Design a protein around this ligand. Sequence first.
Ligand SMILES: [Cu+2]
Lengths: 151, 22
Amino acid sequence: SEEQVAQDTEEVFRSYVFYRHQQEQEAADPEMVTLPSSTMGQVGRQLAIIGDDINRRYDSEFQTMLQHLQPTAENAYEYFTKIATSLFESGINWGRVVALLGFGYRLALHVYQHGLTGFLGQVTRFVVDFMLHHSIARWIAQRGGWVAALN
Amino acid sequence: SSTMGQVGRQLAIIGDDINRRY
Ligand SMILES: [Cu+2]
């Protein structure tokens, strides 16, 4: 069930994006307020909690990051792919998965803030396909699926 | 960071921090 984990990743990332944006309002991108009590939704919400903590602790790194994301978004795929590949060249663990989720969230948010609309689906596809082709889905399957993140 | 590979390795470090705290 590697392919099962890969398909689940879409809903996990969508729920993560929704809840991270929602709690960032409790302190904007309309596209992140739509289209979500399933297992994967709950996993996304939990991961969004820990990701918000991390985004506050590493704000400057995540902002500096986006200097390589062109303001037109013409290199979105290149930027995402290269950064995530460097992220996982040294191995896989749950923390690094959560970091990838937060990276995708900030990329999707920033491309909207630069005036490119309707791109959240593509960042979701970026995340799903990367996790599939970089053995992240197989790893998560080997630890019991996305549901194992609830521990 | 300065380059995108540097950025990815910094994210690896942050992910290891997450893995150790959660
Ligand atoms: Cu910018």
